[PDB]
Symmetry: C5
Subunit: 307 residues, 5 copies
């Protein structure tokens, strides 16, 4: 086997998206290995630019085709470069940019934790083993934590493993080990935007839904509650482009469900606190009579769902 020492320089992780759980990454790969010695012009290293590499691959040079595993589509490779040394070693350097994909857990949506993963791997050769993955992070999200949405903690985490591909039993089935380099960068979502756009107004609407008790005419109270129905409906589309069709409810979907349920219970407890009267007046039947401790007693039932 031949030894290949990779070096990944990350330039900027941008374009994050939660509807598809993707993120665009840009950077440089620098792979380096050792082959047979050679005679170069003069006695210096020989640099070979974008299209001059094909003429060297045609004549018999060995250059592996390193690919990214968790990529959507195919990366948009910029320039390329080879640097043939006279002592024997070779250094393939190339710029990459691609939309990678990972798995995200939005069970606690606004206060979220993810990790961006890059999985590099040879495409054709089973016996060429990556020795040591090094990563250099030059991203701007670490030191500008007030403009970005995703803070980046730590530095990185790199692991060199072996993958077993069983679909490659065409080749002798005992020769399908593929070395792989996984690189993880942990990120923390900055929740300070969803706190005054989906938690404060929805909380205010919820707390202002029990105040309809403080009225003299139920004929006005039903319309009062059906007015807040429209606001709670309005805050249901505003949260329809923030996160995907998830089967589990998040901190905001729970607030929307509670906003529906609180108003529905207001209706159901303002109807049955009147439709079993004994006199014939509007505000009676032990809930609408006093209106000094009951309009504040139903307030703590929602706090159970909050707590």
């Amino acid at each position: 086997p031949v030894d290949v020492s990779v070096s990944i320089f990350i330039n900027k992780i941008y374009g994050v998206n939660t509807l598809e759980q993707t993120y665009k990454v840009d950077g440089y790969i620098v792979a380096q290995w050792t082959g047979k010695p050679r005679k170069t012009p003069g006695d210096k290293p020989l640099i070979v630019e974008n299209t001059q590499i094909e003429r060297w691959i045609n004549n018999g040079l060995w250059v592996p085709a390193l690919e990214f595993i968790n990529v959507v589509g195919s990366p948009d490779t910029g320039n390329k470069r080879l640097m043939l040394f006279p002592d024997g070693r070779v250094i393939y350097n190339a710029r990459f940019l691609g939309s990678f994909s990972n798995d995200m857990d939005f069970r606690l949506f606004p206060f979220d934790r993810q990790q961006f993963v890059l999985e590099l791997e040879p495409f054709s050769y089973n016996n060429q083993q990556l020795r040591f993955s090094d990563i250099q992070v030059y991203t701007e999200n670490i030191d500008n934590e007030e403009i970005d949405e995703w803070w980046i903690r730590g530095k990185a985490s790199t692991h060199i493993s072996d993958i077993r591909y069983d679909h490659l039993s065409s080749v002798q089935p005992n020769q399908n080990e593929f070395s792989r380099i996984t690189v993880r960068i942990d990120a923390v979502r900055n929740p300070s935007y969803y706190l005054w756009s989906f938690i404060l107004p929805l909380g205010l609407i919820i707390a202002a839904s029990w105040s309809v008790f403080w009225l003299e005419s139920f004929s006005e109270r039903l319309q009062t509650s059906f007015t807040l129905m429209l606001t709670v409906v309005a805050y249901a589309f505003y949260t329809s482009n923030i996160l995907p069709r998830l089967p589990y409810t998040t901190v905001i979907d729970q607030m929307i469900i509670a906003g529906y349920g609180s108003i529905f219970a207001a209706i159901l407890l303002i109807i049955f606190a009147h439709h079993r009267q004994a006199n014939g007046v509007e505000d009676d039947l032990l809930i609408q009579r006093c209106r000094l401790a009951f309009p504040l007693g139903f307030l703590a039932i929602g706090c159970v769902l909050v707590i």
Copy 2:
């Protein structure tokens, strides 16, 4: 004829879209056949990477152009390689990433069942017969049932058919039958999102629509209804984002059709219950007592009849 054994490795089926009934598929293809023997450098199998293949086809190598039938556009092939063995056989291996299209049936929308189909076929040859398909699928199945909207049941299903093409009747009669490989993957939609976003709130709005019958002031029994009209109009648009323009009503669209009438009929059961008399300028007295059966107790029949 020559015999070509195919093996398809599916990596991730993502980007499903019911608006156009498409889905993006990523994976690898490994076709393997047998030709004439040859002398290779040393005695090992000779591997030929991305752009070195085009120099072997020029010299006289036989490599078929396999295509996908049900693709939208043209797949974005990644790397590719040949593996020429000295005993004679050849192994063409190549990564693909396409945007395939199937037919979907949303007559029962949220509790849906589909199947993702892939169809390989030679483009130019009729006498080259694919022996057998072997799909190696490891897209997540049991842990995929909490994040992804679809669940992958079973393992797979592969068949090998013989299509007869009529537009190629210019050539000899027997020479217009191409073999084809079809691969089906059954999937079940996770309906747990449309149960607290389009059925729970609509189900409450439906039942909170005849509550206006439990009122006294006809001067407001129309405003309390025209507010729910606007609520149902609000939910009407929030559904046009999900589904295509289907001529048959789904399980959700019906809850919208029953959202106008159940409200609309309300007026038609209020108005005709308001002027049952020919004397008096004020409301109708004798009708305000039997409201429990005809005005409101009939939508209970509307709920137990169709459901």
Copy 3:
């Protein structure tokens, strides 16, 4: 001149779009002409795949560059193939997938009827005359009854014509005849979706906007109307994404205009029936104080027009 016999196999006409009047088409072209005899390996028709064609064109083979006229952006050709026969004839076969553009007439929108047009033509040669077109259309959408939005009635109609190009008077003004193949496929829109989403709710709002006559409190008969003016405007956006910026009014636009007019006329008849200088009388038993004659008398104000 040389005689070319095109044959077009249509696979699926998808992605129709009325905002730009485009439609994507996928299929195969099979052109076939006769040249001079030649010696092929063995005595078989020699097949030439994707990239081997550009090498046969170098040595002096004649292959015309057929183009599509009414295409939006150059198409996305998939595989290509030549079939050089020993007796002399040549068969150029190639897959195409492109987004074509036709003209549409939405003067009667929901019950529409269009035709998809494909125009093929040589790009460089004036003296090479397409002889006989042949459409092979086993499309997946004529077997439709309630699946897709467009039914297909007949599936084929072809015509071979000539064209005079004036910008090509650089050559002698006689050498600018360009034979062209036109292929028309008549399609009929499935109106069963716009009947219970734009004709039913608007049709009910129209008749529910004149019901405000059955009231007595003019202090509230103007507010109960402005909650309906808020409904008709809600369907004015729901229509702005299913049609282009058309000068002529469709059926749905006519319905929305009639809704605006009906609500405005209701307001004006309410105001004039109360107090003004055009009548002078104060609160007669006009449209407000009557519940039988006039609230059913304005039913022919909208039912006078024919469409």
Copy 4:
């Protein structure tokens, strides 16, 4: 220098975009110059198709690289063609499609008079002088008056000018003057769509804003106005996808501003006419009663503007 007479056949101008001031153009270019005589096969003109040009440029043929100045991105060139004559002249013909960009002025929006500009220019040579420009435009003009949004008036205007380029002052002083070919087509927007979608309903809301003065119950004359506030807010969004966020106000923006101001004044002249004292000991409650002169006196407050 060498004289190159360019002809331009305009096939269709579509995809106009008010939000970005772009428009896609599809057409042909036919440049033609004279060089040195040559011997061609036979005695006929020699036609050279798409990829055979790049081999004639290798041997020493002179073909200029004509670029488009005001293009967004790079155009999508379709087929190409050369026609080498034996007498010496050469005719380079090529199909083009590109998203061009001009400057537009929406100070009077619906009745626009924008114009479409195409700017062709050599990229490398200053001494090659475009000598004569013909445009051959047969895009739909007088039948375009009912389906397309823009009418074409006159269809053609061309001019050949010279740009002095300062960034090329590294070369000799006289050798940075590049000729051009400018092509201007006169378009006129068809305003018949914005007259019954943004002017009729907005005007009806304007006229229905003072109608609240025909009331007595001040306790509801604020709700009857806060409903029209919501109506004007609804129409405020329906305009935000037509105009490119212009600093100057168009007609519709002026109408929205008037819709805010009219209702705000209606509020401010209701509140200060409610507690307006008669003499200082009893509130004047007779200004609101007179509903003949006062409600009409507000109609001319908006009709003072002459736009």
Copy 5:
């Protein structure tokens, strides 16, 4: 080392986007250096067009690969050119068009002062030192200030720095310093659109929220605020498409927060001014018969939000 003088001609900066902080730039690059003398045909500068460069690189010409650092993807290069002089120097000229990326600070959103940055840098050579960057910008500065959203004031400032790359210790660690050219252009947003679309109407809504105090029926003083809630929610989505998910609140976000808080405080003040009677039932006329003395304290705090 090789001394390379760079000139950059900027043609138009369009497509600015603040939701992701990009901007598309189009222009020309002219790099010029000195090599070894040579004999050219005749005695003139030899011009080499797009596809003829890749041949001169084959024979041994030295052309550097200059990349852009802060680009999203890879620029869409148009034409290229080489101008080989006989005295020795070479002039590589090429058109570029790419979507760049800078950092923007919306802490004071409408009155923005963002700036546009371009960064050239060699990709492969460290001993290839750019001498002196000149920039030629004719992006309009005085006449454009009424049509486009971003004024461009002053000249563009250019700086040649040296970056040290740590990930390039593969090559001898004392030769990893690459020169870089940075070009900054000063932009200033034209805040004449957000003044009559997000500050004027929001200001009128905020100033019309305290006006509910001048009312008599508290049974209706609670519905007015719940109607204003809907308008304040309507002005909350209209802002969610002009800004990114920013943690710091802008001016418009502060206005939305103040609009929520003003109506919430109005509710909490009016409900307590009602509860002052030691109940919430039996509305009395004491608050209106003293509306000129007592409730002025409820508005006196409402004008503290301003100062």
